[PDB]
Amino acid sequence: ARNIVVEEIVRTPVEMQQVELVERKGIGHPDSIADGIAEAVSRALCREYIRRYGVILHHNTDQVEVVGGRAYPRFGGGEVVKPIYILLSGRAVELVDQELFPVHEVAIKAAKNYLKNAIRHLDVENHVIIDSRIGQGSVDLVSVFNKARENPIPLANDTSFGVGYAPLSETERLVLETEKLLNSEKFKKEYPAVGEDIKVMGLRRGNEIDLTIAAAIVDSEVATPKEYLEVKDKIKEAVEELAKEITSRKVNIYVNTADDPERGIYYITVTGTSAEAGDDGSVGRGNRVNGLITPNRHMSMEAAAGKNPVSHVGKIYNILAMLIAEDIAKTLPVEEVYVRILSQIGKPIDQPLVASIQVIPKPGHSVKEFEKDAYSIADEWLANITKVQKMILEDKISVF
Amino acid sequence: ARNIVVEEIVRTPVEMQQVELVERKGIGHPDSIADGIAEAVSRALCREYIRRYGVILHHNTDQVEVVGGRAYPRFGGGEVVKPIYILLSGRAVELVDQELFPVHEVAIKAAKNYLKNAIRHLDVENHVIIDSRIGQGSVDLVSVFNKARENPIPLANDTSFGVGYAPLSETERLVLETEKLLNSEKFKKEYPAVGEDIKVMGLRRGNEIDLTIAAAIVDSEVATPKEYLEVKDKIKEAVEELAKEITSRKVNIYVNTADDPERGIYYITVTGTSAEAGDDGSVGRGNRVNGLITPNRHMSMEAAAGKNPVSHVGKIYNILAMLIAEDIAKTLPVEEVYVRILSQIGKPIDQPLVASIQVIPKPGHSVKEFEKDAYSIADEWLANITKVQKMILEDKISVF
Ligand SMILES: Nc1ncnc2c1ncn2[C@@H]1O[C@H](COP(=O)(O)OP(=O)(O)CP(=O)(O)O)[C@@H](O)[C@H]1O
Ligand SMILES: C[S@@+](CC[C@H](N)C(=O)[O-])C[C@H]1O[C@@H](n2cnc3c(N)ncnc32)[C@H](O)[C@@H]1O
Ligand SMILES: [Mg+2]
Ligand SMILES: [Mg+2]
Numbered sequence: 076a077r078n079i080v081v082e083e084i085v086r087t088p089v090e091m092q093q094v095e096l097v098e099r100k101g102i103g104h105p106d107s108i109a110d111g112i113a114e115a116v117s118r119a120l121c122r123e124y125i126r127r128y129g130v131i132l133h134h135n136t137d138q139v140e141v142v143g144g145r146a147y148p149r150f151g152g153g154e155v156v157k158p159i160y161i162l163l164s165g166r167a168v169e170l171v172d173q174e175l176f177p178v179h180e181v182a183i184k185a186a187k188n189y190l191k192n193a194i195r196h197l198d199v200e201n202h203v204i205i206d207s208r209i210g211q212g213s214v215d216l217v218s219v220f221n222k223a224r225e226n227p228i229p230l231a232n233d234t235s236f237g238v239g240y241a242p243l244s245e246t247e248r249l250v251l252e253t254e255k256l257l258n259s260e261k262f263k264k265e266y267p268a269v270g271e272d273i274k275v276m277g278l279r280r281g282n283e284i285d286l287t288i289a290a291a292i293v294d295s296e297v298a299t300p301k302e303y304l305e306v307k308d309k310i311k312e313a314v315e316e317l318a319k320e321i322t323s324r325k326v327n328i329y330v331n332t333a334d335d336p337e338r339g340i341y342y343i344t345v346t347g348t349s350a351e352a353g354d355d356g357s358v359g360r361g362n363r364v365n366g367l368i369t370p371n372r373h374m375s376m377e378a379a380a381g382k383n384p385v386s387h388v389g390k391i392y393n394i395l396a397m398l399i400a401e402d403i404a405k406t407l408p409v410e411e412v413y414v415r416i417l418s419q420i421g422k423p424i425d426q427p428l429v430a431s432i433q434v435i436p437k438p439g440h441s442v443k444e445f446e447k448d449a450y451s452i453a454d455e456w457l458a459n460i461t462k463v464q465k466m467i468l469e470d471k472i473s474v475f
Numbered sequence: 476a477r478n479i480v481v482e483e484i485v486r487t488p489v490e491m492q493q494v495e496l497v498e499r500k501g502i503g504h505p506d507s508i509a510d511g512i513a514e515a516v517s518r519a520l521c522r523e524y525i526r527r528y529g530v531i532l533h534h535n536t537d538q539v540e541v542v543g544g545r546a547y548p549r550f551g552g553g554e555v556v557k558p559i560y561i562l563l564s565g566r567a568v569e570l571v572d573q574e575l576f577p578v579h580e581v582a583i584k585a586a587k588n589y590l591k592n593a594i595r596h597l598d599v600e601n602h603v604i605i606d607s608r609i610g611q612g613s614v615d616l617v618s619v620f621n622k623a624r625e626n627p628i629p630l631a632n633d634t635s636f637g638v639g640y641a642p643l644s645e646t647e648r649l650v651l652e653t654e655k656l657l658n659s660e661k662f663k664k665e666y667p668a669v670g671e672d673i674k675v676m677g678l679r680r681g682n683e684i685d686l687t688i689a690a691a692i693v694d695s696e697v698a699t700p701k702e703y704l705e706v707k708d709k710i711k712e713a714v715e716e717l718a719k720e721i722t723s724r725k726v727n728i729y730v731n732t733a734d735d736p737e738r739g740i741y742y743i744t745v746t747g748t749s750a751e752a753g754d755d756g757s758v759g760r761g762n763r764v765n766g767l768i769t770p771n772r773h774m775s776m777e778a779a780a781g782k783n784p785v786s787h788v789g790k791i792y793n794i795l796a797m798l799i800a801e802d803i804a805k806t807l808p809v810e811e812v813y814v815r816i817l818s819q820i821g822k823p824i825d826q827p828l829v830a831s832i833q834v835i836p837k838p839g840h841s842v843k844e845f846e847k848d849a850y851s852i853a854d855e856w857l858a859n860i861t862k863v864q865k866m867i868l869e870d871k872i873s874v875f
């Protein structure tokens with residue numbers, strides 16, 4: 076009864092296309108900082124709503140503005156001159172039965188806690204000003220969310236679509252795992268100088284990949300330009316070892332391409348994030364739920380970070396489409412699968428207006444052989460969409 | 476001498492796929508407000524930079540946060556209780572040879588002027604607080620003039636990427652023209668109750684299109700819920716006529732699906748924008764430069780609104796790719812044309828690393844019959860990239 080449509084599409088697989096471009100904005104990137112703050116605020120509000128009332132109340136904190144500060148990085152240790160200003164926005168329930176909910180206290184505390192754990196060399200108390208302007212949702216949009224027990228499956232709060240796909244190409248996996256490696260605790264233990272503001276661009280032309288990495292180096296961990304260049308080489312070497320595990324194509328690796336040692340220009344920072352130096356961020360300006368920006372693929376413009384995991388489809392459908400695509404790619408003979416799920420505002424989220432599954436079958440296979448299998452996969456995920464909510468609160472899935 | 480490559484691509488045309496999704500956020504939509512303000516601020520800064528110094532100085536105002544307020548909409552005329560808060564962010568040159576440039580005065584005045592001309596029932600002076608945190612750039616004019624002399628066409632410092640396509644499918648044209656119609660001046664005088672916060676979602680399933688419209692209705696123009704339902708029907712009728720002008724497919728029109736008259740839930744607003752109440756906005760969260768959100772196509776994540784129209788290569792490339800595609804589709808026999816432009820480091824931006832032109836020819840035609848014509852089109856646009864910049868500053872091209 077669910078509007079699931081499985082169709083064959085003709086197209087050159089991404090792996091066979093001549094030009095493939097993939098980008099990822101690391102954790103310390105201002106846009107990703109905004110995403111992370113939005114998500115941390117949302118999850119904190121969920122937990123606190125449950126802790127106080129045993130139920131999640133309406134709130135979408137998918138609105139964070141990172142206003143870059145000013146800093147003077149110096150080898151051996153720089154200084155921030157003007158702190159980073161972060162405006163928390165969005166919607167949250169502040170009035171609960173005439174009692175006041177600590178919206179701003181929870182949001183600001185969650186934002187700060189995320190920055191403390193995400194950016195290691197960022198002094199949150201002195202390098203960051205966090206203000207909260209989170210408002211209260213509209214009397215009507217709040218009503219569809221409030222239909223809890225009335226609708227065991229929550230109703231969709233908007234008419235929006237989520238887009239996912241699978242499997243990842245070699246270039247996509249390379250870009251994704253490059254950022255994850257350079258921002259993993261293990262790699263940080265090995266090279267503390269590598270900040271979190273890491274931007275990875277993978278550009279494949281034929282069977283040759285150019286992997287450009289922009290990695291902010293913490294100036295307190297490098298005393299001289301030579302130490303900085305050595306940190307760059309270790310980044311390169313680590314990514315070389317990783318690339319050999321991911322693809323047999325030739326991989327050219329470039330680290331901080333804007334550097335000009337002859338002019339003393341170096342990508343060093345005080346805190347490890349370019350947000351310190353006049354670079355701005357906001358929600359929905361970077362990675363999709365799969366952690367990548369893939370113009371060779373298809374994407375939804377719906378941001379996932381900060382949206383409640385109960386009713387907002389921009390987050391739920393982007394996650395579900397990705398998971399449906401992954402399961403199809405993992406179990407059925409498909410070269411590629413793209414999933415698009417469209418909500419109708421005021422319809423249960425398990426009854427999308429359409430769940431489009433476009434498949435490129437592997438050579439020798441026809442879609443009629445497994446179309447019902449793909450149908451069942453999407454139907455089961457849509458029938459268990461509520462599980463995605465738990466996956467968010469239990470920190471089992473990332474949204475950027 | 477330009478690396479323009481015209482290739483044939485074999486793939487299911489969008490018009491031929493079973494499921495197509497298209498979305499457009501009208502001018503009054505909070506995200507579109509942020510985009511519109513971002514671009515309006517940028518254009519105001521450009522004009523004022525030129526008026527004072529005869530040259531545009533660096534600036535990026537692609538950071539605007541529309542914080543929803545609070546309102547009590549009532550049939551016959553409601554009231555705003557908490558004004559909308561808009562934060563202008565980004566960076567701009569405020570010190571020009573140590574003399575002060577009115578960055579914030581220009582920006583806030585431009586944001587207000589854009590709102591006054593965009594949302595007709597919005598009292599900007601009492602319903603909106605606009606504050607600016609745009610950062611300070613310092614420039615010595617001798618340097619900007621010297622980097623002209625040296626390079627008339629700016630050189631690319633990074634690998635930037637633009638994507639365009641043409642022609643628009645019937646569903647894309649239907650979504651686009653629906654928003655344009657309902658937000659046209661003629662329709663506004665005929666139905667003043669229809670606000671500017673108009674979001675159109677088009678779903679094509681085979682040869683049946685479901686067209687969902689979310690239109691904020693001005694509560695001062697509808698005296699009773701019945702008049703509100705009547706306005707909805709008038710929208711439906713106008714779009715029915717428009718649909719018959721575009722396609723011979725079955726078109727189902729749905730307007731404000733969240734309404735629940737039995738519980739008094741209505742999409743009425745005081746100002747004609749949901750920014751007054753339960754929706755927030757930020758830049759780069761909605762339409763692409765072609766005015767649409769198209770998951771069946773290849774979109775860029777890059778926000779174009781607010782980015783400098785002379786120096787930001789990603790914005791001009793996305794616009795140029797769109798224009799190249801449109802010119803190709805309107806002049807040559809192609810079912811579809813996808814245009815991708817990649818810049819080459821330290822080369823002029825009119826000398827891209829590659830200008831990929833992928834074309835699906837119409838039946839009976841082959842690409843080699845018209846490949847040189849498509850080459851010339853893209854070559855001419857790349858040679859007139861500066862004129863395109865002028866078109867942007869002269870408000871002759873839209874970016875959302
Ligand atoms: N010296 C430097 N070298 C390389 N990268 C740097 C850098 N300083 C900052 N960066 C990184 O580049 C980003 C700003 O560069 P830029 O504005 O040209 O990219 P962009 O136009 O694509 C906006 P976005 O970063 O959101 O994609 C910073 O946020 C940071 O991640
Ligand atoms: C549904 S709101 C997003 C949800 C909201 N931000 C929240 O916190 O739940 C997004 C867009 O939908 C439209 N919209 C707002 N209220 C609506 C309603 N009651 N019915 C239909 N569409 C609505 C507006 O154009 C708005 O920009
Ligand atoms: Mg950005
Ligand atoms: Mg939002």
Ligand SMILES: [Mg+2]
Nearest residue numbers: 233235377389
């Ligand atoms: Mg949305």
Ligand SMILES: [Mg+2]
Nearest residue numbers: 506755756760
């Ligand atoms: Mg939005």
Ligand SMILES: [Mg+2]
Nearest residue numbers: 632633634635
């Ligand atoms: Mg750049």
Ligand SMILES: [Mg+2]
Nearest residue numbers: 098274777789
């Ligand atoms: Mg970028």
